[PDB]
Amino acid sequence: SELRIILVGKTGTGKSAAGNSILRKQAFESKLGSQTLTKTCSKSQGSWGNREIVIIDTPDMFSWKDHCEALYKEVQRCYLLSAPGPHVLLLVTQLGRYTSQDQQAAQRVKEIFGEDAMGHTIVLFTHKEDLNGGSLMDYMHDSDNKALSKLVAACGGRICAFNNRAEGSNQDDQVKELMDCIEDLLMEKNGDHYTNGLYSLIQRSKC
Numbered sequence: 001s002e003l004r005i006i007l008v009g010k011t012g013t014g015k016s017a018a019g020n021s022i023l024r025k026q027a028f029e030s031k032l033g034s035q036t037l038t039k040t041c042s043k044s045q046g047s048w049g050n051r052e053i054v055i056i057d058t059p060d061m062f063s064w065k066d067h068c069e070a071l072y073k074e075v076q077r078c079y080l081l082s083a084p085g086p087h088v089l090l091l092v093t094q095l096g097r098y099t100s101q102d103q104q105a106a107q108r109v110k111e112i113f114g115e116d117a118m119g120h121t122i123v124l125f126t127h128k129e130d131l132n133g134g135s136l137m138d139y140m141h142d143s144d145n146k147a148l149s150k151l152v153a154a155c156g157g158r159i160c161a162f163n164n165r166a167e168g169s170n171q172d173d174q175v176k177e178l179m180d181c182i183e184d185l186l187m188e189k190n191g192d193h194y195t196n197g198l199y200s201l202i203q204r205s206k207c
């Protein structure tokens with residue numbers, strides 16, 4: 001049975017890399033800030049355990065401000081690629097580096113996916129290696145970043161961390177932690193995916 005994940009967040013936080021970590025393959029292209037920004041979603045899939053994992057990597061364009069002709073059609077494409085709705089939105093942020101631009105990117109997520117999207121969101125912190133083997137929960141307990149605390153609260157405290165450069169059993173271990181977070185979220189939601197008005201329209205147009 002399908003597990004559908006949509007990656008969201010500020011550009012450069014490591015979301016394409018996180019997609020690669022989850023799928024254990026080079027599904028999405030990571031890039032430096034100097035490189036061209038993306039305008040189209042990319043979709044890839046793989047297996048974890050007995051389950052098909054399907055991931056949509058949202059374009060950098062979804063974080064842009066002001067008028068953008070391509071946005072509406074590509075948001076429609078994102079919905080069509082994730083229908084009947086994502087099980088999880090993974091809001092990707094770099095550990096210790098949550099800024100006003102992250103806050104704004106999170107607002108774009110609510111605009112695109114709806115006010116209630118945080119109820120199916122997990123906050124994924126990249127650069128886990130910066131913890132030096134320390135507890136993520138303890139780090140977040142002591143974090144003084146007020147905007148980050150508010151986001152994490154809106155996401156029901158659901159958090160996880162990746163070192164996207166991890167390999168081997170270290171990679172397996174961090175992906176397992178994310179799957180454990182997803183298991184608990186889905187349990188709370190009786191296995192349901194996120195939905196909204198627009199996802200409903202799509203679902204009701206198919207036989």
Ligand SMILES: Nc1nc2c(ncn2[C@@H]2O[C@H](COP(=O)(O)OP(=O)(O)O)[C@@H](O)[C@H]2O)c(=O)[nH]1
Nearest residue numbers: 011012013014015016017030031126127163164
């Ligand atoms: N050290 C480190 N670098 C990372 C990590 N995740 C991503 N990167 C790097 O951060 C840069 C941006 O990553 P990318 O996947 O393109 O982020 P995106 O813009 O959110 O899709 C790339 O140079 C990645 O190699 C991480 O966990 N640790």
Ligand SMILES: [Mg+2]
Nearest residue numbers: 015016029030
């Ligand atoms: Mg990317």
